[PDB]
Amino acid sequence: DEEIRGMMKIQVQKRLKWGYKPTHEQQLAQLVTFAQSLKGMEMAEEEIPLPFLHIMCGKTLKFSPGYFKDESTTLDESEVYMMDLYCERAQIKDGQSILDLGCGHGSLTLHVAQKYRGCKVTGITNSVSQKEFIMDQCKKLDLSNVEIILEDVTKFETEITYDRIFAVALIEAMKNYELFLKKVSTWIAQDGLLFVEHHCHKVFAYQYEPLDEDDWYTEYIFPGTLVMSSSSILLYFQEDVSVVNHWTLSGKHPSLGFKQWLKRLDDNIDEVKEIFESFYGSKEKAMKFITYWRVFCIAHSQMYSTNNGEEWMLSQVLFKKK
Amino acid sequence: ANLIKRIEHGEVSDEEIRGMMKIQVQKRLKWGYKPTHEQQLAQLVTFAQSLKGMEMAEEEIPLPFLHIMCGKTLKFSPGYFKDESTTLDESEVYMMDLYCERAQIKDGQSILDLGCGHGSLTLHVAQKYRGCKVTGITNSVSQKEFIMDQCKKLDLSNVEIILEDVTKFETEITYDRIFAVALIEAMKNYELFLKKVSTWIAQDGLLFVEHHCHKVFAYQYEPLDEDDWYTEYIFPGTLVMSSSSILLYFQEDVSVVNHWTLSGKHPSLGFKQWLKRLDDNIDEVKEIFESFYGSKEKAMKFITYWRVFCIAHSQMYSTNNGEEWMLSQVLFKKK
Ligand SMILES: C[S@+](CC[C@H](N)C(=O)[O-])C[C@H]1O[C@@H](n2cnc3c(N)ncnc32)[C@H](O)[C@@H]1O
Ligand SMILES: C[S@+](CC[C@H](N)C(=O)[O-])C[C@H]1O[C@@H](n2cnc3c(N)ncnc32)[C@H](O)[C@@H]1O
């Protein structure tokens, strides 16, 4: 842990001199050549055991961050505050069709559905198990409210349109932001909104690709080249959607989230070893998936804490059609 | 406000002004900078949505004087100094070329220029590409006729100047290219502006826009405390100092194709050049002014304003090596 925090504060500082430039002309230009580059990519590049997440992620199994109001906010609680923020900032109304892109394990689909029994809430994931699990909760807590399409978002067509489209933690897997925002806009209703949240740097976007030959990080964690977006970056993909509002949250909310994920992991470790040996068929491999998750949490709760959250952070954009 | 009174009578040094203007800049930068990006972003966004409910815009100098103060094109907007030893004349010409390149001007296109002014950019484009029909748009009577006389001087059946306020111009002509160089600074509600202009863009047309801005935050010109001479001395009459980024939020009728900024060094240097040529001919601007305005005192009054205005903004644009106040250029396609 200790050395890894250190081995990651150095990765941070060299990603920090990478992307910062001494004048606004150079800074801005770099970001505008970056966006144009992602128009030369595909829309997106072309399975975690459920027992293990009941431990690491908390009640709703929200595999994305939460709003911590103070550092006594439970991880459980933070998950709730964040998704009411979502619901508040998406201007969600009782009775409107809701589409939830990349449900995961439905933490938001079930939230809206329970908080607004008038809304018909439709979710989309590419996992058979996420779908079944979710539809298990509907069963349990009496929801004729939900629907789970099974389809890869980047493939899905439909005639159906939606009063409010959600899409959180999803941009992180998309290369061409243009084709993505292009497709989703034909799913927007007469006068509807689209809610995008996304990890980012405050100031510059970039590919997940080695700084040195001596930065283990980009290889161990990312293993494929993703894009760490820039907070403002979606302002440049406004051809089929228009920005209505734009917010950001300090990087202390992810940093705290990762902090919660690591402690519960480490509080229940024996059970974690047991679940991952059943699943990966080996004490060596379990002992190495434990390592990953700890390193991911440690490193990234240190990556987001940077400069009291004023480097990497959460970014929220609200959209309307055309 | 007796300050102004003695400011006119010459008692206040050019470095007191530059001195007071530095404290103005410090106050404005303390006011506008938030400590978290969440706040800063929500400063701008609220200020941006604020503009959406205003009017587009709210409801004249001697030519011998601009001839003196300004370059031989009379560009009343900034120039591009590759170097400190670049001249006003070249700075101008460098800047309009830059425009002619960033707006993808080709021979043959039709060009709509909005707030053409005394025509520096209209005539630049028109002499350079005989293939374009260029339409200028100003509301000054003097400005139409001047350009129309320089069109006789240069022999170019290549220009057209319509006398109208942009804010109320109604047409169904479309032009492959449109400039709005140093114009949005007269406007407040950019949405309703950008919507009007967007009907003037032809299929695959391009609009090009320049505006003075601060790098980060935007703001109305209202006095900071009650020690703020500069605000209501320099401005009538609430205008809005845009943000670099602010026009990323006005993308309902036009899309963005590119976006650049230029250091506040260029506008800093021009204003410096404006002062020198004005001061290397003070007596000629005195005559020109004591003749035009009707008295030696409003002469005094208006010669002071311009020395003040050249000195404050030149100081203001130099803050932090050109990285607070600054130029934003944005190129749009018809959404
Ligand atoms: C990686 S995110 C995080 C989970 C979710 N955003 C949340 O906050 O609960 C999105 C989720 O949607 C699914 N997903 C990811 N990419 C997808 C794609 N291209 N098409 C469909 N589902 C996808 C994944 O199974 C993943 O759990
Ligand atoms: C210095 S700028 C643009 C001209 C500059 N010479 C150039 O092309 O770089 C300011 C100009 O805005 C124009 N303007 C402001 N409000 C206007 C309006 N409502 N209608 C027409 N022109 C307007 C004025 O004529 C003024 O010359």
UniProtKB/Swiss-Prot annotation, chain A:
The active site is at C297. Pathway: Alkaloid biosynthesis. InterPro entries: SAM-dependent_MTases_sf (IPR029063). Its EC number is 2.1.1.300. (S)-tetrahydropapaverine binds at E172. It is found in: Cytoplasm. Gene3D superfamilies: Vaccinia Virus protein VP39. It catalyses: (+-)-pavine + S-adenosyl-L-methionine = N-methylpavine + S-adenosyl-L-homocysteine + H(+); (S)-reticuline + S-adenosyl-L-methionine = (S)-tembetarine + S-adenosyl-L-homocysteine + H(+); (S)-stylopine + S-adenosyl-L-methionine = (S)-cis-N-methylstylopine + S-adenosyl-L-homocysteine; (S)-scoulerine + S-adenosyl-L-methionine = (S)-cis-N-methylscoulerine + S-adenosyl-L-homocysteine. It is an enzyme of class 2 (transferase). S-adenosyl-L-homocysteine binds at F63, S64, G102, N126, Q130, D152, V153, V168. One of its GO terms (biological process) is methylation. S-adenosyl-L-methionine binds at F63, S64, G102, N126, Q130, D152, V153, V168. Induction: Not induced by elicitor treatment. SUPFAM superfamilies: S-adenosyl-L-methionine-dependent methyltransferases. GO terms for cellular component: cytoplasm. It comes from the Eukaryota. Keywords: Cytoplasm, Methyltransferase, S-adenosyl-L-methionine, Transferase. GO terms for molecular function: methyltransferase activity. Homodimer. N-methyltransferase with a substrate preference for (+-)-pavine and (S)-reticuline, but also active with the protoberberines scoulerine and stylopine and, to a lesser extent, tetrahydropapaverine (THP) and tetrahydropalmatine. Is not active on (R)-reticuline, cryptopine, glaucine, codeine, canadaline, noscapine and berbamine. Belongs to the CFA/CMAS family. This is Pavine N-methyltransferase.
